[PDB]
Design goal:
Chain A: It is found in: Virion membrane; Host endoplasmic reticulum-Golgi intermediate compartment membrane; Host cell membrane. This is part of a larger assembly, with four copies of chain A. With 242 residues, chain A is an alpha+beta fold. Chain A contains four helices and 13 strands. In chain A, strand 1 and strand 2 form a beta hairpin. The radius of gyration of chain A is 33 Å and the shape is flat. The structure holds a molecule of 2 linked components (NAG-NAG) (3 copies) and 2-acetamido-2-deoxy-beta-D-glucopyranose (NAG) (6 copies). The site of a molecule of 2 linked components (NAG-NAG) has 2 residues of chain A, from loops.
């Protein structure tokens, strides 16, 4: 049923998007609304196949009536997942504050926990001072450059067809622009590494005797025994990346 | 010792703790290889580049076999089978499709190159600031108080090893802003007044090292009738 | 919407508010000590004396002028709400994102009514008025036009996302440097000599 | 439409990457600390409102 007061001469109805959403029955003059039938995406939640073989299904933006067994979230209808009250660090994000995990073994859905509750005893005549220290080492990985490429238009598009090239040359000069773009990309790729690594102008060398007051730098200093002249950590990094 | 002095700790802290610090540094360096190896996805950033490049090239090559609404996807068959005044119409569809594919690939490459350049600039700045000197920017060269760093090279990237300083084993204490003596206020030069319950000492901020209150580590500069919460105790000389 | 969907964010506003409240409580009751290890208690006046000492002014300047500083801080905090409310375009940066998203989506949905040089712009009308052998010629133009529209929209979205990421990185750096510590860089965390944020 | 090729896979991948990046932006900006501190019940800080 509709509530739009059609004047005695209109027949249809539109909106901002310019789509039909109203109509009048010819035999009995009545106003009717038109709405699209429900639709949405499907997402499958699964742990690794090495662990288990069960899955859960989420229908985005639909209530459970249109389709443990069922649970309604702010993102859609969750099927095959059981809801609990305990909160843990998020494992598989789902929607607005909901996560899922594999915990005898089933798939459960909960609300993520931000962190451990803590409170410091603030008082206006008290202070805390450390008496002991710790030295820690952490890593950080940053990309620098990527692969340089170059493309030939005639071989790619036409191959060895003469008439294909004759028709192709009628379009214009797109390929010059493509070549210029690729060349600029390659030059920038070279410049990135040149800027990042070429910081010093000299080539310093470590003394033969590696005694620095008790500090051990064997894992970072280059290894002369192996031909590649790379530190063990560098060898591990090169072998892991394949 | 100088690098410790840069973060607000005296040199005698290092000079009397050289062995312990050396052992801690050795163990921290040793654990790095196992930490890198055990975690499978520690180097996802450097693998995504290769994956993206390979996938883009594979898609571009695979696109050659599409039809785009034509009799076939090979020029040699279309030419011989059909009359030319159909051929110059059939070739156009393939030409347009392949040109569109090339343009898409080039635009994607440009967009990726912008991000790669931004990352390279950040890496260059980090190498300039964390490695060639000591940094005071919070959380820029690790988590804690920065000491020094070492670079290592990786395929299509760089790897940094940050060395920091983390406090531990704190304790409760009682403090006052100033010390009153002979109607004269006293403030510490560098450090904080501290009391264990019956006596008053002055110590640095990041390490408990009590000292006898003396005229050498204090300055008077004022009176005893302005400061809120002042506590009066004898000051030696 | 015809195939267009909007997905909800992972973190609700309550969780973000909890994060902000935790940061405020930590920086009020510990200072900068909680950003580099365990949190250590310290009275607020002593913290502010340390922060003055960090810019080249001795501690007796604070300790002898506590009430004046407190009153000035209270008045400055009070004026903030009126300053924000009075200026009409104070929050243009956040509104522009919503405006641009709405414009892009509206244009994309509006493009469905174009003919692209065909008999009609509705597929059902074409199907119910013709023979399949004579329908591909009409359908191809619509397909090409709609593909072009989708590609344009995707490219614009990527270009905007790059700039949003740059701004987010700047915001993260500002949060790490001005809130979890005291910054000596000029004009990075306000105009003047930085105290706290 | 099936004859044209594999543009749709590229479109879907681009949009999914954009969404993941959008989540990561907030995750990086706000989730700085791993403890949830609470302010003391008595709100006296030497004469300052907060
Ligand atoms: C400061 O911290 C270090 C590291 O935990 C402590 O070093 C340990 O001390 C105990 C007791 O003397 C030894 O049994 C351990 O072998 C030490 N660890 C190492 C790695 O050498 C040190 O004792 C702490 N300082 C104080 C005053 O407690
Ligand atoms: C510096 O550290 C390295 C790494 O542990 C030491 O090399 C180890 O030495 C022991 C004792 O000879 C061997 O059992 C290990 O197999 C060695 N490890 C490796 C990876 O080679 C090295 O000895 C240390 N330097 C000094 C002077 O003690
Ligand atoms: C902090 O400032 C607020 C705002 O001026 C003070 O709260 C006001 O208190 C008066 C008297 O109790 C009320 O008439 C106002 O309505 C309050 N303001 C609001 C916004 O509710 C508060 O007293 C100040 N802090 C302290 C410790 O006094
Ligand atoms: C679920 O569908 C029912 C249909 O009767 C409706 O009453 C309810 O509001 C729907 N839930 C939501 C969250 O829209
Ligand atoms: C937790 O369990 C209680 C049982 O008293 C229930 O009332 C509450 O709704 C549960 N929390 C949820 C479902 O988030
Ligand atoms: C701070 O000192 C005042 C003295 O004026 C006292 O009333 C108050 O209780 C103290 N703060 C706390 C948290 O106890
Ligand atoms: C400092 O004192 C408070 C209250 O007495 C206590 O809760 C806290 O644990 C103490 N600090 C340490 C490091 O034990
Ligand atoms: C406080 O320090 C003084 C000076 O060493 C000492 O004599 C006294 O016993 C200490 N008191 C306590 C409770 O530790
Ligand atoms: C020392 O301090 C106590 C407590 O604050 C006070 O009662 C006493 O009068 C002070 N001494 C002098 C000489 O004023």
């Amino acid at each position: 049923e509709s509530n739009k007061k059609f004047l005695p001469f209109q027949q249809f109805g539109r909106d901002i998007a310019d789509t039909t959403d109203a109509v009048r029955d010819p035999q009995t003059l009545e106003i009717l609304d038109i709405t699209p039938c429900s639709f949405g995406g499907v997402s499958v939640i699964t742990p690794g196949t090495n662990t288990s073989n069960q899955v859960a299904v989420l229908y985005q933006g639909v209530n459970c009536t249109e389709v443990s067994n069922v649970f309604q979230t702010r993102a859609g209808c969750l099927i095959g997942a059981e809801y609990v009250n305990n909160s843990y660090e998020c494992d598989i994000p789902i929607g607005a504050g909901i996560c899922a995990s594999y915990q005898s073994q089933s798939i459960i859905a909960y609300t993520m926990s931000l962190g451990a509750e803590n409170s410091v005893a603030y008082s206006n005549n008290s202070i805390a001072i450390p008496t002991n220290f710790t030295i820690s080492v952490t890593t950080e990985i940053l990309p620098v450059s990527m692969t340089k490429t170059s493309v030939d238009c005639t071989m790619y598009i036409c191959g060895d067809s003469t008439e294909c090239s004759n028709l192709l040359l009628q379009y214009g000069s797109f390929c010059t622009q493509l070549k210029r773009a690729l060349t600029g990309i390659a030059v920038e790729q070279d410049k990135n590494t040149q800027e990042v690594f070429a910081q010093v102008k000299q080539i310093y060398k470590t003394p033969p005797i590696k005694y620095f007051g008790g500090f051990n730098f064997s894992q970072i200093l280059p290894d002369p025994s192996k031909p590649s002249k790379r530190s063990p950590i560098e060898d591990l990094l090169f072998n892991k990346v394949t | 010792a100088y690098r410790f002095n840069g973060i607000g700790v005296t040199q005698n802290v290092l000079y009397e703790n050289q062995k312990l610090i050396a052992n801690q540094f050795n163990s921290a360096i040793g654990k790095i290889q196992d930490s890198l190896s055990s975690t499978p996805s520690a180097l996802g950033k450097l693998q995504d580049v290769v994956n993206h490049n390979a996938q883009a090239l594979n898609t571009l090559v695979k696109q050659l076999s599409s039809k785009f609404g034509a009799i076939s996807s090979v020029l040699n068959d279309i030419l011989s089978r059909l009359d030319p005044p159909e051929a110059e119409v059939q070739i156009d569809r393939l030409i347009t499709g392949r040109l569109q594919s090339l343009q898409t690939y080039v635009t994607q490459q440009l967009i990726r190159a912008a991000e790669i350049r931004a990352s390279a600039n950040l890496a260059a700045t980090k190498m300039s600031e964390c490695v060639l000197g000591q940094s005071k920017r919070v959380d820029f060269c690790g988590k804690g108080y920065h000491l020094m760093s070492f670079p290592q090279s990786a395929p299509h990237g760089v790897v940094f090893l940050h060395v920091t300083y983390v406090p531990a084993q704190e304790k409760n204490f009682t403090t006052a802003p100033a010390i009153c003596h002979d109607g004269k206020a006293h403030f510490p030069r560098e450090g904080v007044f501290v009391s264990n319950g019956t006596h008053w000492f002055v110590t640095q901020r990041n390490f408990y090292e009590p000292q006898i209150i003396t005229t050498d580590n204090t300055f008077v500069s004022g009176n005893c009738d302005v400061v809120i919460g002042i506590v009066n105790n004898t000051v030696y000389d | 919407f015809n195939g267009l969907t909007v997905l909800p964010p992972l973190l609700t506003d309550e969780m973000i508010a909890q994060y902000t409240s935790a940061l405020l409580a930590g920086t009020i009751t510990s200072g900068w000590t909680f950003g580099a290890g365990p949190a250590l208690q310290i009275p607020f006046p002593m913290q502010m004396a340390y922060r003055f000492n960090g810019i080249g002014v001795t501690q007796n300047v604070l300790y002898e002028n506590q009430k004046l500083i407190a009153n000035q801080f209270n008045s400055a905090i009070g004026k903030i709400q009126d300053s924000l409310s009075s200026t009409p375009s104070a929050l243009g940066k956040l509104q522009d994102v919503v405006n641009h998203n709405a414009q892009a989506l509206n244009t994309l949905v509006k493009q469905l009514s174009s003919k692209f040089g065909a008999i009609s712009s509705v597929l059902n009308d074409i199907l119910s008025r013709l023979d399949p052998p004579e329908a591909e010629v009409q359908i191809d133009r619509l397909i090409t036009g709609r593909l072009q529209s989708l590609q344009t929209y995707v490219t614009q979205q990527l270009i905007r996302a790059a700039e949003i990421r740059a701004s987010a990185n700047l915001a993260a750096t500002k949060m790490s440097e001005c809130v979890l510590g005291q910054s000596k860089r000029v004009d990075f965390c306000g105009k003047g000599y930085h105290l706290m944020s």
